[PDB]
mmCIF file of C-alpha atoms in Angstrom:
data_model
loop_
_atom_site.group_PDB
_atom_site.id
_atom_site.type_symbol
_atom_site.label_atom_id
_atom_site.label_comp_id
_atom_site.label_asym_id
_atom_site.label_seq_id
_atom_site.Cartn_x
_atom_site.Cartn_y
_atom_site.Cartn_z
ATOM 1 C CA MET E 1 -77.018 -41.054 -56.883
ATOM 2 C CA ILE E 2 -74.646 -42.414 -59.510
ATOM 3 C CA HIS E 3 -76.190 -41.078 -62.717
ATOM 4 C CA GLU E 4 -77.439 -37.905 -60.985
ATOM 5 C CA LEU E 5 -73.903 -36.770 -60.117
ATOM 6 C CA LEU E 6 -73.091 -36.987 -63.820
ATOM 7 C CA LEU E 7 -76.226 -35.007 -64.632
ATOM 8 C CA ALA E 8 -75.281 -32.334 -62.117
ATOM 9 C CA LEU E 9 -71.566 -32.213 -62.917
ATOM 10 C CA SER E 10 -72.098 -32.007 -66.693
ATOM 11 C CA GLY E 11 -73.226 -28.386 -66.375
ATOM 12 C CA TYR E 12 -76.952 -29.100 -66.816
ATOM 13 C CA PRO E 13 -77.857 -29.188 -63.120
ATOM 14 C CA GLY E 14 -81.047 -30.624 -61.695
ATOM 15 C CA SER E 15 -83.269 -29.576 -58.803
ATOM 16 C CA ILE E 16 -81.377 -31.708 -56.274
ATOM 17 C CA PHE E 17 -78.458 -29.348 -56.907
ATOM 18 C CA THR E 18 -80.068 -25.921 -56.786
ATOM 19 C CA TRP E 19 -77.519 -23.636 -58.405
ATOM 20 C CA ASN E 20 -76.935 -20.354 -56.632
ATOM 21 C CA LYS E 21 -74.456 -17.735 -57.819
ATOM 22 C CA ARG E 22 -73.253 -17.369 -54.236
ATOM 23 C CA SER E 23 -72.882 -21.018 -53.177
ATOM 24 C CA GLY E 24 -72.510 -22.794 -56.489
ATOM 25 C CA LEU E 25 -74.006 -26.266 -56.324
ATOM 26 C CA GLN E 26 -75.524 -27.662 -53.145
ATOM 27 C CA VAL E 27 -77.349 -30.912 -52.441
ATOM 28 C CA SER E 28 -80.889 -30.661 -51.043
ATOM 29 C CA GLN E 29 -79.569 -31.754 -47.620
ATOM 30 C CA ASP E 30 -82.727 -32.248 -45.564
ATOM 31 C CA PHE E 31 -83.208 -36.015 -45.174
ATOM 32 C CA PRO E 32 -83.300 -38.533 -42.332
ATOM 33 C CA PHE E 33 -81.684 -40.883 -44.820
ATOM 34 C CA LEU E 34 -78.705 -38.632 -45.692
ATOM 35 C CA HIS E 35 -75.598 -39.275 -43.722
ATOM 36 C CA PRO E 36 -72.407 -37.246 -42.928
ATOM 37 C CA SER E 37 -70.462 -39.821 -44.968
ATOM 38 C CA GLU E 38 -71.992 -38.839 -48.304
ATOM 39 C CA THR E 39 -72.007 -35.200 -47.317
ATOM 40 C CA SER E 40 -68.261 -34.570 -47.376
ATOM 41 C CA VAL E 41 -67.735 -36.441 -50.663
ATOM 42 C CA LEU E 42 -70.626 -34.475 -52.171
ATOM 43 C CA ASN E 43 -69.244 -31.161 -50.956
ATOM 44 C CA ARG E 44 -65.847 -31.982 -52.411
ATOM 45 C CA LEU E 45 -67.487 -32.913 -55.696
ATOM 46 C CA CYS E 46 -69.637 -29.743 -55.759
ATOM 47 C CA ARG E 47 -66.625 -27.459 -56.282
ATOM 48 C CA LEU E 48 -65.648 -29.085 -59.587
ATOM 49 C CA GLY E 49 -69.076 -28.691 -61.174
ATOM 50 C CA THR E 50 -69.368 -25.096 -59.952
ATOM 51 C CA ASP E 51 -65.981 -24.359 -61.549
ATOM 52 C CA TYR E 52 -66.964 -26.037 -64.834
ATOM 53 C CA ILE E 53 -70.198 -24.035 -65.039
ATOM 54 C CA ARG E 54 -68.338 -20.787 -64.345
ATOM 55 C CA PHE E 55 -65.758 -21.666 -67.015
ATOM 56 C CA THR E 56 -68.297 -22.482 -69.727
ATOM 57 C CA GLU E 57 -70.334 -19.441 -68.704
ATOM 58 C CA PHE E 58 -67.252 -17.236 -69.114
ATOM 59 C CA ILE E 59 -66.448 -18.736 -72.533
ATOM 60 C CA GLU E 60 -70.035 -18.313 -73.740
ATOM 61 C CA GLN E 61 -70.186 -14.812 -72.294
ATOM 62 C CA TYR E 62 -67.156 -13.574 -74.222
ATOM 63 C CA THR E 63 -67.317 -15.686 -77.392
ATOM 64 C CA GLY E 64 -70.346 -15.573 -79.678
ATOM 65 C CA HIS E 65 -72.048 -12.464 -78.290
ATOM 66 C CA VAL E 66 -70.595 -9.956 -80.786
ATOM 67 C CA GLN E 67 -69.234 -10.396 -84.294
ATOM 68 C CA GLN E 68 -65.920 -9.034 -83.210
ATOM 69 C CA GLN E 69 -67.434 -5.667 -82.075
ATOM 70 C CA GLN E 76 -66.960 -0.668 -74.669
ATOM 71 C CA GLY E 77 -63.349 -0.360 -75.785
ATOM 72 C CA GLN E 78 -62.307 -1.614 -72.349
ATOM 73 C CA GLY E 79 -59.898 -4.528 -72.549
ATOM 74 C CA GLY E 80 -61.316 -6.181 -69.462
ATOM 75 C CA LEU E 81 -64.678 -6.749 -71.139
ATOM 76 C CA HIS E 82 -63.798 -6.908 -74.856
ATOM 77 C CA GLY E 83 -60.897 -7.780 -77.152
ATOM 78 C CA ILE E 84 -59.368 -10.455 -79.376
ATOM 79 C CA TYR E 85 -56.866 -11.613 -76.732
ATOM 80 C CA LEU E 86 -59.706 -12.481 -74.340
ATOM 81 C CA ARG E 87 -61.598 -14.477 -76.955
ATOM 82 C CA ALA E 88 -58.351 -16.311 -77.730
ATOM 83 C CA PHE E 89 -58.122 -17.044 -74.000
ATOM 84 C CA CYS E 90 -61.667 -18.509 -73.957
ATOM 85 C CA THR E 91 -60.758 -20.531 -77.052
ATOM 86 C CA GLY E 92 -57.791 -22.078 -75.254
ATOM 87 C CA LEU E 93 -59.863 -22.748 -72.124
ATOM 88 C CA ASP E 94 -62.519 -24.942 -73.756
ATOM 89 C CA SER E 95 -59.894 -27.184 -75.357
ATOM 90 C CA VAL E 96 -58.326 -27.442 -71.921
ATOM 91 C CA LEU E 97 -61.779 -28.399 -70.579
ATOM 92 C CA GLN E 98 -62.063 -31.377 -72.955
ATOM 93 C CA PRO E 99 -60.491 -34.162 -70.733
ATOM 94 C CA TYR E 100 -63.023 -33.420 -67.964
ATOM 95 C CA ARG E 101 -65.815 -34.269 -70.397
ATOM 96 C CA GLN E 102 -63.894 -37.348 -71.533
ATOM 97 C CA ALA E 103 -63.614 -38.541 -67.925
ATOM 98 C CA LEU E 104 -67.361 -38.033 -67.314
ATOM 99 C CA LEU E 105 -68.304 -40.081 -70.396
ATOM 100 C CA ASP E 106 -65.763 -42.739 -69.404
ATOM 101 C CA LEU E 107 -67.454 -43.083 -66.010
ATOM 102 C CA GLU E 108 -70.868 -43.253 -67.684
ATOM 103 C CA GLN E 109 -70.023 -46.304 -69.819
ATOM 104 C CA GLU E 110 -68.895 -48.334 -66.801
ATOM 105 C CA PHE E 111 -72.019 -47.296 -64.926
ATOM 106 C CA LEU E 112 -74.132 -48.653 -67.777
ATOM 107 C CA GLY E 113 -72.113 -51.852 -67.494
ATOM 108 C CA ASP E 114 -72.561 -52.083 -63.729
ATOM 109 C CA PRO E 115 -74.043 -49.199 -61.735
ATOM 110 C CA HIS E 116 -73.179 -50.614 -58.326
ATOM 111 C CA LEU E 117 -69.787 -48.896 -58.354
ATOM 112 C CA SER E 118 -69.135 -46.470 -55.515
ATOM 113 C CA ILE E 119 -68.935 -42.685 -55.491
ATOM 114 C CA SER E 120 -65.544 -42.904 -53.756
ATOM 115 C CA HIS E 121 -64.106 -44.207 -57.006
ATOM 116 C CA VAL E 122 -65.616 -41.219 -58.784
ATOM 117 C CA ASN E 123 -63.962 -38.851 -56.314
ATOM 118 C CA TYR E 124 -60.797 -40.921 -56.715
ATOM 119 C CA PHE E 125 -60.870 -40.455 -60.487
ATOM 120 C CA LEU E 126 -61.843 -36.793 -60.342
ATOM 121 C CA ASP E 127 -59.227 -35.994 -57.703
ATOM 122 C CA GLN E 128 -56.713 -34.877 -60.339
ATOM 123 C CA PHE E 129 -58.916 -32.072 -61.635
ATOM 124 C CA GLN E 130 -59.792 -31.144 -58.029
ATOM 125 C CA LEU E 131 -56.377 -29.480 -57.805
ATOM 126 C CA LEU E 132 -56.212 -28.075 -61.327
ATOM 127 C CA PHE E 133 -59.494 -26.116 -61.400
ATOM 128 C CA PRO E 134 -58.935 -23.645 -58.460
ATOM 129 C CA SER E 135 -55.524 -22.677 -59.847
ATOM 130 C CA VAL E 136 -56.855 -21.537 -63.220
ATOM 131 C CA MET E 137 -59.904 -19.938 -61.562
ATOM 132 C CA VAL E 138 -57.876 -17.062 -60.123
ATOM 133 C CA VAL E 139 -56.211 -16.493 -63.498
ATOM 134 C CA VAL E 140 -59.517 -15.777 -65.191
ATOM 135 C CA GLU E 141 -60.817 -13.913 -62.123
ATOM 136 C CA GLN E 142 -57.954 -11.387 -62.161
ATOM 137 C CA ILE E 143 -58.534 -10.549 -65.837
ATOM 138 C CA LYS E 144 -62.199 -9.892 -65.181
ATOM 139 C CA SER E 145 -61.613 -7.993 -61.944
ATOM 140 C CA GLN E 146 -58.911 -5.506 -62.889
ATOM 141 C CA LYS E 147 -60.368 -4.663 -66.352
ATOM 142 C CA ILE E 148 -56.962 -5.372 -67.895
ATOM 143 C CA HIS E 149 -56.452 -3.888 -71.356
ATOM 144 C CA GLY E 150 -54.644 -5.439 -74.324
ATOM 145 C CA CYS E 151 -51.105 -6.821 -74.182
ATOM 146 C CA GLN E 152 -50.994 -6.607 -70.380
ATOM 147 C CA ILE E 153 -53.401 -9.553 -70.380
ATOM 148 C CA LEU E 154 -50.528 -11.523 -71.965
ATOM 149 C CA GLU E 155 -48.344 -10.846 -68.940
ATOM 150 C CA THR E 156 -50.999 -11.821 -66.418
ATOM 151 C CA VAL E 157 -51.124 -15.457 -67.452
ATOM 152 C CA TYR E 158 -47.403 -15.412 -68.155
ATOM 153 C CA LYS E 159 -46.247 -14.887 -64.590
ATOM 154 C CA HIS E 160 -48.569 -17.756 -63.712
ATOM 155 C CA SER E 161 -47.181 -19.951 -66.536
ATOM 156 C CA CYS E 162 -43.675 -20.110 -65.056
ATOM 157 C CA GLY E 163 -45.352 -22.485 -62.621
ATOM 158 C CA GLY E 164 -44.240 -25.220 -60.266
ATOM 159 C CA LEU E 165 -47.016 -27.724 -60.843
ATOM 160 C CA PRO E 166 -46.949 -29.589 -64.199
ATOM 161 C CA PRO E 167 -50.758 -29.758 -64.840
ATOM 162 C CA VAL E 168 -51.397 -26.082 -64.080
ATOM 163 C CA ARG E 169 -48.355 -24.771 -65.985
ATOM 164 C CA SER E 170 -48.924 -27.008 -69.005
ATOM 165 C CA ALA E 171 -52.613 -26.075 -69.072
ATOM 166 C CA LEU E 172 -52.041 -22.314 -69.109
ATOM 167 C CA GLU E 173 -49.158 -22.532 -71.602
ATOM 168 C CA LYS E 174 -51.262 -23.614 -74.597
ATOM 169 C CA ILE E 175 -53.788 -20.849 -74.046
ATOM 170 C CA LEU E 176 -50.908 -18.358 -73.956
ATOM 171 C CA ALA E 177 -49.835 -19.789 -77.329
ATOM 172 C CA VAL E 178 -53.318 -18.917 -78.705
ATOM 173 C CA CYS E 179 -52.970 -15.358 -77.424
ATOM 174 C CA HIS E 180 -49.535 -15.199 -79.047
ATOM 175 C CA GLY E 181 -51.031 -16.228 -82.384
ATOM 176 C CA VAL E 182 -53.583 -13.419 -82.609
ATOM 177 C CA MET E 183 -50.886 -10.780 -81.977
ATOM 178 C CA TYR E 184 -48.683 -12.528 -84.532
ATOM 179 C CA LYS E 185 -51.454 -12.225 -87.100
ATOM 180 C CA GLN E 186 -51.777 -8.474 -86.502
ATOM 181 C CA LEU E 187 -47.983 -8.233 -86.616
ATOM 182 C CA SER E 188 -48.130 -9.922 -90.027
ATOM 183 C CA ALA E 189 -50.020 -6.830 -91.240
ATOM 184 C CA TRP E 190 -48.332 -3.897 -89.514
ATOM 185 C CA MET E 191 -44.769 -5.025 -90.141
ATOM 186 C CA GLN N 507 -65.640 -4.831 -93.620
ATOM 187 C CA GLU N 508 -66.556 -8.006 -91.742
ATOM 188 C CA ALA N 509 -63.453 -9.621 -93.364
ATOM 189 C CA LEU N 510 -60.842 -7.213 -92.022
ATOM 190 C CA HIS N 511 -63.036 -7.073 -88.903
ATOM 191 C CA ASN N 512 -62.273 -10.669 -87.822
ATOM 192 C CA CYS N 513 -59.564 -12.962 -89.180
ATOM 193 C CA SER N 514 -57.733 -14.265 -86.113
ATOM 194 C CA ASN N 515 -60.449 -16.731 -85.090
ATOM 195 C CA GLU N 516 -61.963 -20.011 -86.279
ATOM 196 C CA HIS N 517 -64.932 -18.131 -87.742
ATOM 197 C CA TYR N 518 -62.543 -16.814 -90.423
ATOM 198 C CA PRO N 519 -63.047 -19.733 -92.936
ATOM 199 C CA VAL N 520 -66.848 -19.530 -92.889
ATOM 200 C CA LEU N 521 -66.887 -15.767 -93.434
ATOM 201 C CA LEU N 522 -64.181 -16.184 -96.079
ATOM 202 C CA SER N 523 -66.355 -18.629 -98.014
ATOM 203 C CA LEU N 524 -69.365 -16.350 -97.615
ATOM 204 C CA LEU N 525 -67.578 -13.298 -99.009
ATOM 205 C CA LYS N 526 -66.068 -15.512 -101.707
ATOM 206 C CA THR N 527 -69.547 -16.444 -102.924
ATOM 207 C CA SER N 528 -71.163 -13.043 -102.345
ATOM 208 C CA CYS N 529 -68.772 -11.235 -104.731
ATOM 209 C CA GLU N 530 -69.471 -13.636 -107.601
ATOM 210 C CA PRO N 531 -71.934 -11.520 -109.698
ATOM 211 C CA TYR N 532 -70.238 -8.144 -109.175
ATOM 212 C CA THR N 533 -66.899 -9.313 -110.571
ATOM 213 C CA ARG N 534 -68.699 -10.393 -113.728
ATOM 214 C CA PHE N 535 -70.348 -6.958 -113.880
ATOM 215 C CA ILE N 536 -66.887 -5.408 -113.730
ATOM 216 C CA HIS N 537 -65.742 -8.036 -116.254
ATOM 217 C CA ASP N 538 -68.389 -6.816 -118.737
ATOM 218 C CA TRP N 539 -67.808 -3.067 -119.237
ATOM 219 C CA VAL N 540 -64.050 -3.545 -119.768
ATOM 220 C CA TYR N 541 -63.896 -6.615 -121.987
ATOM 221 C CA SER N 542 -67.045 -5.984 -124.003
ATOM 222 C CA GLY N 543 -67.812 -2.365 -123.196
ATOM 223 C CA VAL N 544 -71.236 -3.537 -122.058
ATOM 224 C CA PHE N 545 -72.426 -1.555 -119.050
ATOM 225 C CA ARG N 546 -74.609 -4.111 -117.254
ATOM 226 C CA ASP N 547 -76.844 -3.333 -114.264
ATOM 227 C CA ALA N 548 -79.686 -5.296 -112.714
ATOM 228 C CA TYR N 549 -81.092 -3.749 -109.519
ATOM 229 C CA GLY N 550 -78.581 -0.997 -108.835
ATOM 230 C CA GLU N 551 -76.061 -3.058 -106.861
ATOM 231 C CA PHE N 552 -73.209 -1.979 -109.157
ATOM 232 C CA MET N 553 -71.421 1.021 -107.624
ATOM 233 C CA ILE N 554 -71.292 3.344 -110.669
ATOM 234 C CA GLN N 555 -74.584 3.939 -112.433
ATOM 235 C CA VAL N 556 -75.477 5.382 -115.830
ATOM 236 C CA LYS N 566 -71.320 16.800 -128.797
ATOM 237 C CA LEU N 567 -70.094 15.628 -125.406
ATOM 238 C CA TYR N 568 -71.865 12.294 -126.105
ATOM 239 C CA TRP N 569 -71.704 10.626 -122.713
ATOM 240 C CA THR N 570 -74.336 10.871 -120.014
ATOM 241 C CA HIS N 571 -72.880 8.090 -117.874
ATOM 242 C CA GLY N 572 -72.776 8.765 -114.147
ATOM 243 C CA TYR N 573 -70.642 7.925 -111.132
ATOM 244 C CA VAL N 574 -71.018 7.519 -107.343
ATOM 245 C CA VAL N 586 -65.294 -0.780 -99.363
ATOM 246 C CA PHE N 587 -63.034 -0.511 -102.418
ATOM 247 C CA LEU N 588 -59.860 1.156 -103.610
ATOM 248 C CA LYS N 589 -60.944 4.598 -104.779
ATOM 249 C CA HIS N 590 -57.729 4.786 -106.838
ATOM 250 C CA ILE N 591 -59.284 2.359 -109.354
ATOM 251 C CA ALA N 592 -62.978 3.260 -108.801
ATOM 252 C CA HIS N 593 -62.781 6.278 -111.111
ATOM 253 C CA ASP N 594 -60.417 4.330 -113.368
ATOM 254 C CA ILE N 595 -63.133 1.814 -114.247
ATOM 255 C CA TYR N 596 -65.518 4.659 -115.141
ATOM 256 C CA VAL N 597 -62.985 5.971 -117.627
ATOM 257 C CA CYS N 598 -61.975 2.456 -118.775
ATOM 258 C CA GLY N 599 -65.493 1.530 -119.836
ATOM 259 C CA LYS N 600 -66.180 4.653 -121.880
ATOM 260 C CA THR N 601 -62.896 4.204 -123.754
ATOM 261 C CA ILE N 602 -64.233 0.929 -125.157
ATOM 262 C CA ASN N 603 -67.400 2.811 -126.154
ATOM 263 C CA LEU N 604 -65.158 5.098 -128.249
ATOM 264 C CA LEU N 605 -63.278 2.356 -130.125
ATOM 265 C CA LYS N 606 -66.517 0.742 -131.340
ATOM 266 C CA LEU N 607 -66.999 3.684 -133.710
ATOM 267 C CA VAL P 1482 -59.316 -10.929 -94.414
ATOM 268 C CA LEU P 1483 -59.292 -9.997 -98.102
ATOM 269 C CA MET P 1484 -57.475 -7.170 -99.832
ATOM 270 C CA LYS P 1485 -57.671 -5.685 -103.309
ATOM 271 C CA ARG P 1486 -54.067 -6.382 -104.277
ATOM 272 C CA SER P 1487 -54.597 -9.737 -105.955
ATOM 273 C CA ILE P 1488 -57.623 -8.717 -108.003
ATOM 274 C CA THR P 1489 -56.933 -5.153 -109.139
ATOM 275 C CA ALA P 1490 -53.330 -6.061 -109.984
ATOM 276 C CA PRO P 1491 -54.136 -8.032 -113.197
ATOM 277 C CA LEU P 1492 -56.607 -5.256 -114.176
ATOM 278 C CA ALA P 1493 -54.705 -1.949 -114.144
ATOM 279 C CA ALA P 1494 -52.151 -3.539 -116.487
ATOM 280 C CA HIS P 1495 -54.990 -3.842 -119.012
ATOM 281 C CA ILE P 1496 -56.462 -0.404 -118.255
ATOM 282 C CA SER P 1497 -53.116 1.180 -119.182
ATOM 283 C CA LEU P 1498 -52.972 -0.692 -122.505
ATOM 284 C CA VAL P 1499 -56.531 0.390 -123.348
ATOM 285 C CA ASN P 1500 -55.727 4.053 -122.659
ATOM 286 C CA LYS P 1501 -52.491 3.849 -124.662
ATOM 287 C CA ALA P 1502 -54.386 2.424 -127.640
ATOM 288 C CA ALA P 1503 -56.879 5.293 -127.360
ATOM 289 C CA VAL P 1504 -54.257 8.070 -127.269
ATOM 290 C CA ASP P 1505 -52.577 6.395 -130.239
ATOM 291 C CA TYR P 1506 -55.923 6.183 -132.087
ATOM 292 C CA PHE P 1507 -56.326 9.936 -131.689
ATOM 293 C CA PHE P 1508 -53.129 11.009 -133.468
ATOM 294 C CA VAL P 1509 -52.860 8.358 -136.145
ATOM 295 C CA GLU P 1510 -56.398 8.841 -137.455
ATOM 296 C CA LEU P 1511 -57.835 12.247 -136.537
ATOM 297 C CA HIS P 1512 -54.405 13.999 -136.396
ATOM 298 C CA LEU P 1513 -54.994 16.133 -133.313
ATOM 299 C CA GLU P 1514 -51.292 16.907 -132.969
ATOM 300 C CA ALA P 1515 -51.562 18.365 -136.461
ATOM 301 C CA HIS P 1516 -54.698 20.271 -135.421
#
């Protein structure tokens, strides 16, 4: 139950957490030895792993599937790949936290899951905020420089982790346009 | 065309090294017919292939200098006389 | 990216000298202007 949550949450899910594309992750949930106490903590923790898998799936889907080339900006373009590039670097401290938990579990595995939820509570807020930002870009098929505005209205934010996280990715998307500007001008 | 095709990414250094090493023999081929007047060809990878006296032939690169090399090599072939 | 403006630039300056030597070699030896 300790190691297995790491194995699920890392993005390489097991059979305890049957991944569906319409429920995300879900525990097997059919035991006379499973209680409501674990259930709520598990369901809270399931959202984070579902978000991580969707994020990495997005990044893989739009980076490394063509060389650089539909002409539709919602499915293709350099700005989008720059977005994915910013997102993975933003995803790095989640991985750092998971490995950090793993070392202490190898030291003593009798630590509780409540501490894991307590540690992972800070990303529990950050992930749903950035989820809608990528979802809008995919949904509206937004072309070119308008993609730059879509994050930008969301990077004048009022929460420090969300605003600071989107801001660096917007800097990446600035840089690709700057490079093309260094040719045309 | 892969070079102009992607430069704004982190895959830019690897492709830059690959094009840097893939143009190594051709520049020497160009470096031959001008500085020795020796038209060298191996497998037909050189772009321009071989009285009125000349039966040399002709055909991404600058086309402004592509014909210029064809006339610059035959000029050396004239001065040898 | 790579352009041909750092490679062909030290070359055309030699191409011009070669052609100038050839047009000189015409007149001073075979006297085509006299022809």
